[PDB]
Write a protein that binds this DNA or RNA. Structure first.
Ligand code: MG
Ligand code: MG
Ligand code: MG
Length: 240
RNA sequence: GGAUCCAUUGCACUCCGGAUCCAGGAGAUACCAUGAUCACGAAGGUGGUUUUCCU
């Protein structure tokens, strides 16, 4: 009830968004004087209310007198003086008395990646196909067949690839865990020539409904080869 | 942000009521698809799913 630099306005329409409300209060209330600020919140405690801070108390007093009851967004404005000085008034007077989520996130990706690289590095030095009991015979006579139907039998496969020449050995690969087939095999020919021939002619060959992929064995032939699980591999189905 | 419902007439100046759902944004997803080319396996990315923020 005692005059003040700041006026308090309530009974405001609660549907109106914050900037709109600040805007429309500025338009209406500058007519009475210089405004330092209009404070609005739409929180539970503060919605329906505004503090208009004027430079002079006299503007405040005239703004209060004139606008009392004024129709504003289909609602009469209720205006009083603020009970207490607004911080910027009080400081003007010397009356005044009192990892982000973006960082935690970025750090976490960074560590997973690094953690991953170390894992791969460690596996890598466990990896040696020349010392694997599964990898036998002449690498240079060995074909690599992937994308096989899980249903395809070792027979059907030996049949399809025998056309290119006598086969010394087939090793289809199974999960050491489930024992489910991995969809790939090594086929060692008697003669390098016949492997080369399967290589030229069998790629894309349809066996049990699925186009198979045919390549040479690279594990034991290609300088610097790493398999897909060690960050290498060929093919591009899942590049992005 | 927005839609519906509910609560609120509140004196602040450190965001910030509830519910259910929607759009965009940014996270996260253990699960599904992509049946990933090297002897059981990438990670992830992309598309789902679920979920947490922001508007
Ligand atoms: Mg090695
Ligand atoms: Mg998968
Ligand atoms: Mg994946």
């Amino acid at each position: 009830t005692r005059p003040n630099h700041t006026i308090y306005i309530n009974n405001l329409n609660e549907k109106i968004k914050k900037d709109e409300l600040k805007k429309s209060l500025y338009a209406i209330f500058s007519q009475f004087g210089q405004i330092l600020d209009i404070l609005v919140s739409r929180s539970l405690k503060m919605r329906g209310q505004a503090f208009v801070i004027f430079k002079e108390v006299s503007s405040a007093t005239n703004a209060l007198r004139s606008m009392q009851g004024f129709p504003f967004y289909d609602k009469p404005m209720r205006i009083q003086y603020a009970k207490t000085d607004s911080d910027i008034i009080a400081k003007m007077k010397g009356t005044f008395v009192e990892e982000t989520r973006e960082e935690r996130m970025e750090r976490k990706r960074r560590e997973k990646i690094e953690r991953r690289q170390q894992e791969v590095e460690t596996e890598l030095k466990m990896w040696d196909p020349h010392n694997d009991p599964n990898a036998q015979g002449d690498a240079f006579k060995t074909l690599f067949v992937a994308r096989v139907n899980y249903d395809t039998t070792e027979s059907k496969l030996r049949r399809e690839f025998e056309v290119y020449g006598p086969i010394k050995r087939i090793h289809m690969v199974y999960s050491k865990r489930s024992g489910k087939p991995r969809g790939y095999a090594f086929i060692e020919y008697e003669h390098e020539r016949d492997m080369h021939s399967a290589y030229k002619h069998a790629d894309g060959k349809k066996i049990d409904g699925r186009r198979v992929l045919v390549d040479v064995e690279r594990g034991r032939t290609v300088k610097g080869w790493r398999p897909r699980r060690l960050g290498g591999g060929l093919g591009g189905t899942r590049r992005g």
